[PDB]
mmCIF file of N, CA and C and ligand atoms in Angstrom:
data_model
loop_
_atom_site.group_PDB
_atom_site.id
_atom_site.type_symbol
_atom_site.label_atom_id
_atom_site.label_comp_id
_atom_site.label_asym_id
_atom_site.label_seq_id
_atom_site.Cartn_x
_atom_site.Cartn_y
_atom_site.Cartn_z
ATOM 1 C CA UNK K 23 102.474 -33.562 40.516
ATOM 2 C C UNK K 23 102.627 -33.306 39.055
ATOM 3 N N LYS K 24 102.434 -31.893 38.684
ATOM 4 C CA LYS K 24 102.593 -31.541 37.184
ATOM 5 C C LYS K 24 101.817 -32.276 36.235
ATOM 6 N N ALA K 25 100.555 -31.740 35.967
ATOM 7 C CA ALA K 25 99.828 -32.617 34.962
ATOM 8 C C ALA K 25 100.212 -32.558 33.525
ATOM 9 N N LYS K 26 101.584 -32.695 33.412
ATOM 10 C CA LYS K 26 102.174 -32.790 31.962
ATOM 11 C C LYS K 26 103.614 -33.019 31.905
ATOM 12 N N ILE K 27 103.881 -34.385 31.427
ATOM 13 C CA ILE K 27 105.195 -34.727 31.350
ATOM 14 C C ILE K 27 106.118 -33.794 30.770
ATOM 15 N N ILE K 28 107.282 -34.312 30.271
ATOM 16 C CA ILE K 28 108.262 -33.218 29.624
ATOM 17 C C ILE K 28 109.003 -33.882 28.395
ATOM 18 N N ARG K 29 108.958 -33.225 27.481
ATOM 19 C CA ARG K 29 109.752 -33.698 26.254
ATOM 20 C C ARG K 29 110.258 -32.929 25.393
ATOM 21 N N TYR K 30 111.522 -32.210 25.356
ATOM 22 C CA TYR K 30 111.979 -31.149 24.656
ATOM 23 C C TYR K 30 113.599 -31.520 24.158
ATOM 24 N N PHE K 31 114.089 -30.539 23.516
ATOM 25 C CA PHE K 31 115.359 -30.775 23.006
ATOM 26 C C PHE K 31 116.251 -29.416 23.371
ATOM 27 N N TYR K 32 115.690 -28.693 24.083
ATOM 28 C CA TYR K 32 116.382 -27.428 24.369
ATOM 29 C C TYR K 32 116.777 -26.735 23.082
ATOM 30 N N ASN K 33 117.169 -25.682 23.302
ATOM 31 C CA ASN K 33 117.722 -24.597 22.049
ATOM 32 C C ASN K 33 117.654 -23.056 22.431
ATOM 33 N N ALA K 34 118.614 -22.848 23.242
ATOM 34 C CA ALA K 34 118.615 -21.399 23.689
ATOM 35 C C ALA K 34 118.727 -20.299 22.467
ATOM 36 N N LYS K 35 119.718 -19.907 22.267
ATOM 37 C CA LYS K 35 119.581 -18.983 20.934
ATOM 38 C C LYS K 35 118.640 -17.905 21.112
ATOM 39 N N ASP K 36 118.594 -17.073 21.976
ATOM 40 C CA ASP K 36 117.581 -15.991 22.281
ATOM 41 C C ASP K 36 116.750 -16.419 23.275
ATOM 42 N N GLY K 37 116.713 -17.670 23.682
ATOM 43 C CA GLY K 37 116.040 -18.190 24.690
ATOM 44 C C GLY K 37 114.952 -19.374 24.188
ATOM 45 N N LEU K 38 115.223 -19.929 23.014
ATOM 46 C CA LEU K 38 114.520 -21.091 22.514
ATOM 47 C C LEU K 38 114.488 -22.358 23.048
ATOM 48 N N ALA K 39 113.815 -23.148 22.692
ATOM 49 C CA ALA K 39 113.900 -24.745 23.146
ATOM 50 C C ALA K 39 112.481 -25.503 22.742
ATOM 51 N N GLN K 40 112.616 -26.044 21.667
ATOM 52 C CA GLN K 40 111.452 -26.884 20.928
ATOM 53 C C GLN K 40 111.175 -27.847 22.117
ATOM 54 N N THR K 41 109.800 -27.361 22.916
ATOM 55 C CA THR K 41 109.395 -27.899 23.929
ATOM 56 C C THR K 41 108.121 -28.779 23.522
ATOM 57 N N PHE K 42 108.280 -30.039 22.982
ATOM 58 C CA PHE K 42 107.234 -30.987 22.609
ATOM 59 C C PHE K 42 106.834 -31.844 23.647
ATOM 60 N N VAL K 43 106.077 -31.434 24.649
ATOM 61 C CA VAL K 43 105.570 -32.156 25.878
ATOM 62 C C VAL K 43 104.401 -33.026 25.490
ATOM 63 N N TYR K 44 104.241 -34.060 26.349
ATOM 64 C CA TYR K 44 103.020 -35.098 26.079
ATOM 65 C C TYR K 44 102.114 -35.198 27.436
ATOM 66 N N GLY K 45 101.035 -35.108 27.306
ATOM 67 C CA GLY K 45 100.114 -35.280 28.561
ATOM 68 C C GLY K 45 100.762 -36.212 29.496
ATOM 69 N N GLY K 46 100.161 -36.141 30.769
ATOM 70 C CA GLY K 46 100.636 -37.156 31.808
ATOM 71 C C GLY K 46 101.227 -36.230 32.883
ATOM 72 N N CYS K 47 100.942 -36.995 34.151
ATOM 73 C CA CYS K 47 101.391 -36.156 35.291
ATOM 74 C C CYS K 47 102.934 -36.342 35.341
ATOM 75 C CA UNK X 2 96.025 -43.987 21.664
ATOM 76 C C UNK X 2 96.919 -43.333 22.098
ATOM 77 N N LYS X 3 98.089 -43.408 21.410
ATOM 78 C CA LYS X 3 99.240 -42.488 21.486
ATOM 79 C C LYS X 3 98.882 -41.025 21.303
ATOM 80 N N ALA X 4 97.801 -40.433 21.636
ATOM 81 C CA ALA X 4 97.685 -39.128 21.523
ATOM 82 C C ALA X 4 97.578 -38.180 22.687
ATOM 83 N N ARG X 5 97.005 -37.007 22.566
ATOM 84 C CA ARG X 5 97.096 -36.294 23.687
ATOM 85 C C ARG X 5 98.367 -35.681 24.221
ATOM 86 N N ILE X 6 98.916 -34.999 23.397
ATOM 87 C CA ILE X 6 100.432 -34.517 23.583
ATOM 88 C C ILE X 6 100.590 -32.995 23.544
ATOM 89 N N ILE X 7 100.814 -32.331 24.718
ATOM 90 C CA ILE X 7 101.003 -30.977 24.783
ATOM 91 C C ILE X 7 102.355 -30.361 23.995
ATOM 92 N N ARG X 8 102.212 -30.722 22.799
ATOM 93 C CA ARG X 8 103.445 -30.228 21.929
ATOM 94 C C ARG X 8 103.593 -28.898 21.947
ATOM 95 N N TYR X 9 104.558 -28.477 22.946
ATOM 96 C CA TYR X 9 104.827 -27.085 23.084
ATOM 97 C C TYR X 9 106.045 -26.773 22.197
ATOM 98 N N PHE X 10 106.224 -25.276 22.260
ATOM 99 C CA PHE X 10 107.455 -24.915 21.339
ATOM 100 C C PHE X 10 108.135 -23.653 21.943
ATOM 101 N N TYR X 11 108.713 -23.699 23.275
ATOM 102 C CA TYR X 11 109.439 -22.619 23.852
ATOM 103 C C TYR X 11 110.095 -21.681 22.504
ATOM 104 N N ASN X 12 109.482 -20.708 22.534
ATOM 105 C CA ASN X 12 110.338 -19.807 21.502
ATOM 106 C C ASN X 12 110.599 -18.424 22.047
ATOM 107 N N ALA X 13 111.878 -18.082 21.746
ATOM 108 C CA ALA X 13 112.162 -16.634 22.502
ATOM 109 C C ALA X 13 111.439 -15.583 21.824
ATOM 110 N N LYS X 14 111.759 -14.494 22.250
ATOM 111 C CA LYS X 14 110.893 -13.090 21.784
ATOM 112 C C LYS X 14 110.891 -13.231 20.243
ATOM 113 N N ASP X 15 112.060 -13.812 19.741
ATOM 114 C CA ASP X 15 112.062 -13.819 18.195
ATOM 115 C C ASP X 15 110.792 -14.135 17.621
ATOM 116 N N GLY X 16 109.948 -14.939 18.195
ATOM 117 C CA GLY X 16 108.482 -15.176 17.603
ATOM 118 C C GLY X 16 107.319 -15.322 18.872
ATOM 119 N N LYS X 17 107.036 -16.231 19.382
ATOM 120 C CA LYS X 17 106.035 -16.038 20.459
ATOM 121 C C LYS X 17 105.492 -17.630 20.769
ATOM 122 N N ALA X 18 106.475 -18.204 21.480
ATOM 123 C CA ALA X 18 105.888 -19.767 21.884
ATOM 124 C C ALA X 18 105.338 -20.455 20.813
ATOM 125 N N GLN X 19 104.506 -21.460 21.157
ATOM 126 C CA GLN X 19 103.661 -22.322 19.989
ATOM 127 C C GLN X 19 103.353 -23.762 20.552
ATOM 128 N N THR X 20 102.238 -24.034 19.919
ATOM 129 C CA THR X 20 101.712 -25.429 20.430
ATOM 130 C C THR X 20 100.927 -25.905 19.279
ATOM 131 N N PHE X 21 101.234 -27.127 18.885
ATOM 132 C CA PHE X 21 100.231 -27.795 17.940
ATOM 133 C C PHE X 21 99.243 -28.770 18.513
ATOM 134 N N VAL X 22 97.956 -28.281 18.676
ATOM 135 C CA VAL X 22 97.100 -29.135 19.470
ATOM 136 C C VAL X 22 96.157 -30.002 18.225
ATOM 137 N N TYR X 23 96.330 -31.232 18.589
ATOM 138 C CA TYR X 23 95.624 -32.136 17.729
ATOM 139 C C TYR X 23 95.204 -33.406 18.177
ATOM 140 N N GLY X 24 95.121 -33.734 19.412
ATOM 141 C CA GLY X 24 95.009 -34.885 20.229
ATOM 142 C C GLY X 24 93.730 -35.479 19.663
ATOM 143 N N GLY X 25 93.403 -36.827 19.522
ATOM 144 C CA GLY X 25 92.048 -37.399 19.215
ATOM 145 C C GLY X 25 91.566 -38.083 20.328
ATOM 146 N N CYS X 26 92.541 -38.674 21.081
ATOM 147 C CA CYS X 26 92.139 -39.687 22.323
ATOM 148 C C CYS X 26 92.342 -38.783 23.640
HETATM 149 C C1 LIG U 115 105.161 -15.354 24.308
HETATM 150 O O1 LIG U 115 104.128 -15.360 24.946
HETATM 151 C C2 LIG U 115 106.321 -16.187 24.873
HETATM 152 N N1 LIG U 115 105.760 -17.409 25.661
HETATM 153 C C3 LIG U 115 106.434 -18.403 26.138
HETATM 154 O O2 LIG U 115 107.608 -18.279 26.260
HETATM 155 C C4 LIG U 115 105.898 -19.315 26.919
HETATM 156 N N2 LIG U 115 105.734 -20.456 26.646
HETATM 157 O O3 LIG U 115 105.792 -21.430 28.087
HETATM 158 C C5 LIG U 115 105.458 -22.758 27.726
HETATM 159 C C6 LIG U 115 105.655 -23.636 28.972
HETATM 160 O O4 LIG U 115 105.787 -22.990 29.985
HETATM 161 N N3 LIG U 115 105.366 -24.765 28.678
HETATM 162 C C7 LIG U 115 105.363 -25.647 30.119
HETATM 163 C C8 LIG U 115 105.222 -27.121 29.568
HETATM 164 O O5 LIG U 115 106.302 -27.710 29.123
#
């Protein structure tokens, strides 16, 4: 692995989810 | 550096995902 770490705060509501990810495996 | 962040924005059909690209390093 995944050439992209993960950093979000979820947010379903119609299927939403602020996904602010940062580079990095 | 603290740049290069794949700032994503999982957005439901209500809109259309999103990503603010502006990494400098
Ligand atoms: C319209 O095209 C809706 N698009 C999406 O919902 C797509 N976003 O997916 C972003 C994703 O999978 N990011 C993975 C890394 O965190």
